[PDB]
Amino acid sequence: YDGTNCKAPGNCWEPKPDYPAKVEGSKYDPQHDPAELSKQGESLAVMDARNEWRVWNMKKTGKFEYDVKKIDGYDETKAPPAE
């Protein structure tokens, strides 16, 4: 594996001598729990959600409020009023 034998443009990986071409099944199988691999995306989802409320409230009120819990009409499961 010298990095010059490409399977295609931009794809030149090759397993080193003695190593698997696929980790799944081998002794180097990471076995990542899917529940775990999803935490990040879920997190961005909830943050972005809270930000929408923050943005909406300053536009309607005129003043800014970070704590969504103190935003008049905040509903954790819904998005701000389509206005």
Binding site: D2, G3, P9, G10, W13, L37, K39, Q40, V55, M58
Partner: protein
């Protein structure tokens, strides 16, 4: 932002990280030069009230200097008319748990400034370790808005400095050592409303690519490589965070930056080129779409996080034509130069002949020819690999002298032993999976753990080193060059040095309170030229010192390489300002003295 480029034309201000959009850290001033640098003296100083790494540089806009700080990241505003008074300070409240998921000290690299318009006055931007990006009025310092960008519950923090372009503030990301998938985000300067976000791995719709992405260089790779180069879902936790610096060309409206290393450090747990980690990006600013991307280190194996400084310049081609360029001293030991409007590979030189993970980079294919003898892999302990994970160049923001057409590179001379190990991924926990042992490179004193740095003036076209100098410790904070023929920079052992740009001779220096890891800055006030720099050792080089460690492999293997550092410096924090003969508003003792009047 046009007004920002306009403000940059005045030597009076330093409105962004690398002074201006070309990120050259270069000043046209000549008041301070080779002749009189011997008379350079401290004008005044300011302690930040906090210890730990003090990276980045202060911003100056008119009679005001803005100062960011490491955790809890409180921002200060100083009155240049009398630096003794603190105009304002915005001190946030953060969950101290954020400190727990910081890999390499609780540092912060800088602030950003938006010129304001006929609706909203100038604003200062800051990022917090806990993941928040916030805007504050520049006059009073009162908060305008705050938005969540990174969740520390998953080991995702922020240390990068925010960057302003037009009406957008860019926010990077940190946490690859925690398995965080990297992403950059753009917010509206006024409302903080997210306009776009682009990831470094996964589907092309999250990668945000232009219809003609990598059209000029198809061989770099194009569509679906965000999934195709990873096995399975490994890319969901494949790093690629950008915590380095930005650069922007308003002419073609493209800003540039580099994506970090893939996670984990254990290369056997992630087959493939792991795109688009370790790549140089050219993204349309307003939309965020990538026009081009070049992967410098396919399938990383040494943590050569590719987030380093991006310096823009207009030099003559090797074939005799004026080309719009981009030079980038990478962690892998190579200094890349590309046509910043193409992604065209023009130069790819080794910053030091000792780099051995690669034999060479082919400019026609752009592929680095790996030397199997120095790669990493499970059940094996690679030795004497150079550069080490800390790279031959780290976060330091360097400079470019448009007159001499040379780059002043702050280099590191460190190599390492490396052996990976298997480990599970648990959101919020570390996901490194490797044990290191770092030490000085072949040109250093491995016997005594010294000689770990270098500074050189490099020519991107000829690929020649005008001059090289050895430093006791790694020059980690970057450099700054001026029309006066001087090249300033600071050292981890406590000094700010001034060298001759043409010869590389040491013309002057001062023993600051603590080591330096931020870059020098220069501005003009009341017809006087000042040079300011922050001090307060920290960052990766200082974890051993900062956190009182003794295990040489601790601190991701940095503690060993820097065990001698503590004999030259202790923690600190503040900004030191210089001028010729220490001239300042206080040269007249009375300025500032108490007069019954009203609040001073």
């Amino acid at each position: 932002n046009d007004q920002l480029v306009e403000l940059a034309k005045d030597p009076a201000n330093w409105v962004m990280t690398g002074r201006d959009y070309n990120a050259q850290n270069y000043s046209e001033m000549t008041d301070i030069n080779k002749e009189n640098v011997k008379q350079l003296r401290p004008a005044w100083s300011f302690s930040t009230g906090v210890l730990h790494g003090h990276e980045g540089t202060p911003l100056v806009v008119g009679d005001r200097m803005f100062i960011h700080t490491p955790f809890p990241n409180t921002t200060f505003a100083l009155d240049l008319n009398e630096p003794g008074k603190i105009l304002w300070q915005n001190k946030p409240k953060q969950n101290p748990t954020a400190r727990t998921v910081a890999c390499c000290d609780v540092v912060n690299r800088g602030l950003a400034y938006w010129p304001g318009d006929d609706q909203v006055k100038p604003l200062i931007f800051r990022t917090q370790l806990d993941g928040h990006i916030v805007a504050m009025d520049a006059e009073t310092g009162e908060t305008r808005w705050i938005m969540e960008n990174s969740d520390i519950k998953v080991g995702s923090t922020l240390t990068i400095a925010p960057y302003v372009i037009k009406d957008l503030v860019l926010v990077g990301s940190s946490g690859a050592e925690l398995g965080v998938r990297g992403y950059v985000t753009a917010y509206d300067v006024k409302s903080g409303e997210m306009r776009w976000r682009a990831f470094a791995t996964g589907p092309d719709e999250e990668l945000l690519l232009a219809e003609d992405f990598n059209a000029p260089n198809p061989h770099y790779g194009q569509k679906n490589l965000g999934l195709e180069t990873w096995e399975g879902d490994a890319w969901k936790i494949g790093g690629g965070t950008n915590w380095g610096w930005y650069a922007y060309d308003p002419e073609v409206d493209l800003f540039y930056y580099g994506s970090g290393n893939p996670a984990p450090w254990n290369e056997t747990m992630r087959p493939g080129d792991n795109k688009w980690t370790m790549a140089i990006w050219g993204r349309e600013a307003t939309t965020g779409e990538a026009k081009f991307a070049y992967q410098k280190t396919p399938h990383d194996e040494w943590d050569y996080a590719g987030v380093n400084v991006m310096m823009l310049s207009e030099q003559e081609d090797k074939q005799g034509q004026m080309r719009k360029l981009l030079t980038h001293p990478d962690r892998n030991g190579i200094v890349y130069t590309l046509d910043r409007t193409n992604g065209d590979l023009i130069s790819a030189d080794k910053m030091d002949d000792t780099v051995n993970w690669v034999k060479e980079v082919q400019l026609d294919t752009g592929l680095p020819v790996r030397d199997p003898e120095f790669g990493t892999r499970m059940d094996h302990k690679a030795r004497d690999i150079c550069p080490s994970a800390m790279g031959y160049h780290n976060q330091g923001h360097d400079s470019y002298d448009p007159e001499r057409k040379v780059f002043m590179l702050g280099i590191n001379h460190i190599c390492m032993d490396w052996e990976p190990f298997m480990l599970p991924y648990r959101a919020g926990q570390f996901f490194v999976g490797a044990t290191l042992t770092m030490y000085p490179g072949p040109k250093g004193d491995r016997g005594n753990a010294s000689g770990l740095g270098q500074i050189k003036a490099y020519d991107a076209i000829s690929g020649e080193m005008k001059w090289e100098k050895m430093e006791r410790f790694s020059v980690w904070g970057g450099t700054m060059a001026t029309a006066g023929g001087l090249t300033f920079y600071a050292t981890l052992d406590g000094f700010i040095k001034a060298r001759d740009s043409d010869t590389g001779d040491l013309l002057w220096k001062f023993k600051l309170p603590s080591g330096v890891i931020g870059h020098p800055m220069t501005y003009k006030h009341d017809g006087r030229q000042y040079v300011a720099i922050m001090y307060g050792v920290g960052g990766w080089p200082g974890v051993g010192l900062v956190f009182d460690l003794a295990d040489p492999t601790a601190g991701l293997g940095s503690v060993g390489a820097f065990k001698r550092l503590q004999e030259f410096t202790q923690m600190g924090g503040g900004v030191m300002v210089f001028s010729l003969d220490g001239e300042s508003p206080y040269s007249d003792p009375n300025v500032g003295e108490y007069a019954p009047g009203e609040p001073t």
